[model samples]
Target: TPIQQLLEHFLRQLQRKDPHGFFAFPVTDAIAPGYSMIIKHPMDFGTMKDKIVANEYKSVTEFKADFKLMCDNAMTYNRPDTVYYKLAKKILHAGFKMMS
Candidate 1:
């Protein structure tokens, strides 16, 4: 039940720290065998403050690079200790676990 536990822990983390109610959900659609996508909140795509945009990647390396950039940008403008930041990192870690 590791996956279930991961998701449950992240949900609590997300709810506790979300100020603007932004959601960061994960998906496996339209990617390779070992890749995943984190569909960001709608606010992150537009003119919202502290935007964290999403993009499709061709490989695991590219996905990791872009995801890290997104998370870094999120923490740069927002609080690094925030639940949102922690949730994002947790999601990334869970995705990696799934792939491995």
Candidate 2:
């Protein structure tokens, strides 16, 4: 629960810090490692959109469940070895360090 709140807080901060969406290096880097495969497949981005928009997370439990799921999905499509994937993990880990 705290982790979910922490993530939401970080996301809000990110939104405020880069209202223009300029701070998307994590997503950007995530794509590079899988560009060739992704370009040919063309379903990775679609999968991401689909997963995120599938439904609203109605409860804190759902948020926690889906948060990890989202991270897992990101790793699945981007490959855990890529910079983007690492950045994504780091961002989460950064949020994972939040105080009460």
Candidate 3:
């Protein structure tokens, strides 16, 4: 998944226990051709799982920006990296409502 909690915290600052499910999971509803949405990327999942287990946030804002770039690159270029990048970005960007 796109670390929904982190995304929510960055954008909403909602301080909820499990915001990822609420914010990020709904992205699948917006998927489309050329560019699409997915809840999880298999490759990034490994790294994400590790980060989560470690209770890490390389600066929540930094994480959110990094995620946005990842998705832009993915959707614009159509690479495997883009898939995971987009997932993370989209979830995090959920608070931004896919802006910019």
Candidate 4:
């Protein structure tokens, strides 16, 4: 049994909400030029799943921070009117029901 079990469910639910694969994988330089330089700490669902299974997060808040990071990164890298930015914002708030 794991105290963080709910966190996994929350993450899976968020993944399902991602209509496009935008948040499913990391943003490579090929897709977004200067992404590495712009976002020093890029985040994505793929890494979050690995971090969860590896017990890398100490608490739900820690996971939440990374989730925010993922969303904020998209919002910053892409235009405010772009689908990626809006989609990230959509999922970001959607996940809030699971935590503080």
* Most lDDT-accurate candidate: 4
Worst 10 residues of 1 by lDDT: 45-54
TM-score of each: 0.38, 0.42, 0.33, 0.91
Residues 43-66 of candidate 2: C-alpha lDDT, one tens digit per residue? 222232333355443444544444
By how many angstroms RMSD does model 4 differ from the true structure? Answer: 1.4
lDDT of 4 by residue, 1-100 (tens): 2635867887888898896779888999999999999998999999998888888888878989999999999999999898888898888898886464
Candidate 2 stretches with Cα past 4 Å from truth are 1-10, 14-55
What Cα-based lDDT does every candidate model obtain? 0.42, 0.44, 0.42, 0.87
Candidate 4 weakest ten by summed lDDT? 1-10
What digit string (tens of lDDT, one per residue) describes model 3 on residues 1-100? 3664654444334213234432233233335343334424412223433455565655556554544544454454345465444554455456345423
In terms of TM-score, which candidate is stronger, 2 or 4?
4
User: What are the clashing pairs of model 1?
Assistant: none
Q: What's the lDDT for candidate 4?
A: 0.87
Residue 33 lDDT (model 3): 45
Best by TM-score: 4
